Amino acid sequence: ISGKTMRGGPRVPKAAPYPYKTKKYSVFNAIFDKTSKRFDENSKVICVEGPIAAGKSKFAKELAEELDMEYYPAVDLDLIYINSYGYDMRKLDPQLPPSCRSYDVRNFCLDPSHDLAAQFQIRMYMLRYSQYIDALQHVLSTGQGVVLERSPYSDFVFMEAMFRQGYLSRGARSVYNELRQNTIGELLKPHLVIYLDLPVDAVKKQIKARNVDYEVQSKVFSDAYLSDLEQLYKQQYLKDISTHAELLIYDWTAGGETEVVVEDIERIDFNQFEADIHNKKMLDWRFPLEAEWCEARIKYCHEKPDLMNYFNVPRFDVPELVRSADDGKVWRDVWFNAPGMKYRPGYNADMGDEGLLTKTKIGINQGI
């Protein structure tokens, strides 16, 4: 909110950030370390969304730099198909059965009708969900606000747009809603959301500017498909989130300047809504007592594994998402014997890790 010019200098944290990447924050940690002491005017969450290929990433980086905000790059399937040691899981796909073959954005743009599309869309929701929670931990433990490109709240638009084009089936949409309902309610909605309304014709021109191989060659980015996204952002997402978060709309800040945009944000006031307790605007982040602050911090810092275990919703009547038992055995063999997947990250000796005899530590909010 207070840019570097307003403060005249870099952000001055109220107190030292808690090392949330390395130390857990359970109940007994909360007794000695309090949460509210670190919150500033800039302790907020910003979602910089827009249509496809609207230069959100460039705008976010510049924006997050002015407001001294942490910038979180948009999720991609490389986070699933590239392990920590850097090995590419996709190289293993010749071995795997066809149903378990790797699927990415490239594939979606090239064979959008494949049954793995329903899988692919749920993964994006799951990835955004985990990343979104990671931002909250950074906010609550460091007090520095975060800038996100696309929140999990906005992800159902792509699933809905894909459904209208007929790529998905009725079942896949039914499954997606149950996951979203089962999980979405546990997040804190963003303080501010910024939208970059590029008209439909413009984005179609803009996509060809990137000159990405598969996108230009693809057929998915049709007028109908791209039009569906526009109708979904404005009619369903933006109309809903504005009840909680401040909403700014620009034709394209990616093509425009950000210094004007930062000066637009700082004009927006975030305290007028604080007066009424039950006011919907920014309701989620209204904690009366210090206990409520710590509870939210504990939930995301210490109970994220619970948050990521709600995605277990059993639905087998849908045939697309089900993975056959015979494939699962084969897939388990190949997947978990790949270099670096034998053990948890940081223990695979064959990948060069050393000292395992005297090593006993595991990461926090780490897998396995």
């Binding site: 307790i277 039950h278 009366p288 007592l289």
Partner: protein, 173 residues
């Protein structure tokens, strides 16, 4: 003697109390009975100190539940039951008749009133409630009182946590 008539009334008010439906009808019935039970208890005791306390304690509970009755069950109905009025009035006079023709030396409770005590009982010539309430604040039973204190204070922490004041008022939405 009035002890038997107190027996009749407490019975009578209890019969109707089983048949009340309206919460305030229940409350009025209960309030009337709290008077009688308070009166009756002091008959069979060396003092009425506890009737005063009991009366005072319950009246606190009487007000509070009206506040919630008037917020939750405000719109409800009464129905005069001619079966009930006759039945209670029928037995009430019937019971009152017995108390006049009762061997009411036999019906009196054996618990020793202050006057029922002997004249030699040296411990009965002190203040009205000195000894009885004494060891509430002497070793070792005093710790029980102390235990209540935490129990009451710990209770005071329970209500605020169950209540969650900050999330709004109470309305019968």
């Amino acid at each position: 003697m009035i002890q038997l008539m107190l027996y009749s009334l407490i019975i009578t008010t209890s019969i109707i109390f089983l048949n009340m439906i309206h919460p305030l009808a229940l409350g009025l019935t209960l309030l009337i009975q709290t008077i009688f039970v308070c009166l009756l208890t002091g008959l069979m005791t060396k003092s009425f100190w506890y009737s005063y306390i009991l009366f005072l304690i319950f009246l606190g509970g009487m007000l509070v539940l009206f506040i919630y009755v008037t917020s939750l069950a405000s719109n409800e109905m009464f129905n005069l039951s001619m079966k009930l009025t006759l039945f209670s009035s029928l037995i009430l006079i019937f019971m009152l008749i017995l108390s006049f023709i009762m061997d009411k030396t036999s019906s009196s409770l054996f618990l020793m009133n202050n006057d029922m005590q002997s004249i030699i009982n040296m411990n009965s010539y002190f203040m009205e409630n000195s000894l009885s309430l004494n060891k509430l604040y002497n070793f070792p039973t005093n710790f029980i009182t102390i235990l209540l204190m935490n129990y009451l204070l710990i209770t005071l922490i329970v209500i605020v946590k169950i209540t969650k004041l900050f999330k709004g008022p109470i309305r019968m939405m």
